[PDB]
Amino acid sequence: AKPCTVSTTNATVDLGDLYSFSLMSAGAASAWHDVALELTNCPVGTSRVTASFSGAADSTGYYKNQGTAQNIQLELQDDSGNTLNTGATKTVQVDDSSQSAHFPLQVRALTVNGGATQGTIEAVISITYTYS
């Protein structure tokens, strides 16, 4: 189907300062932090927008920290409990009246193995849209 207009080409989510003592146990995680994507002027005939996610994964399957903190990975979810690791997809309905679409997402830091160490958190998740 014909494409919408991407409103949010870039989005940032800042997990802020996390303390290593709170990321000690295996499976420990930060609070969720919201991030959202928006599309506009979805043409007539286009009623669903599919986002395909990608980014470098580490051995845990979650997104790899490109920063220096060790034993940290990044998790992306939608607003319904679905994990969106690399290669995942999520589809939303275009709002019929406004001809817009949006993706309410959330990110957290996770230590799968435990024992997070001090350092930066840095990652980039890429999204390609398809239309139906």
């Binding site: 800042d14 997990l15 990321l23 991030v35 997104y63 920063g67 958190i121 990652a123 998740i125 999204i127």
Partner: peptide, 13 residues
Amino acid sequence: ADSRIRIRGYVRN
């Protein structure tokens, strides 16, 4: 990519 999400943060001792 059509969109990119940048994730930022810091783990502090």
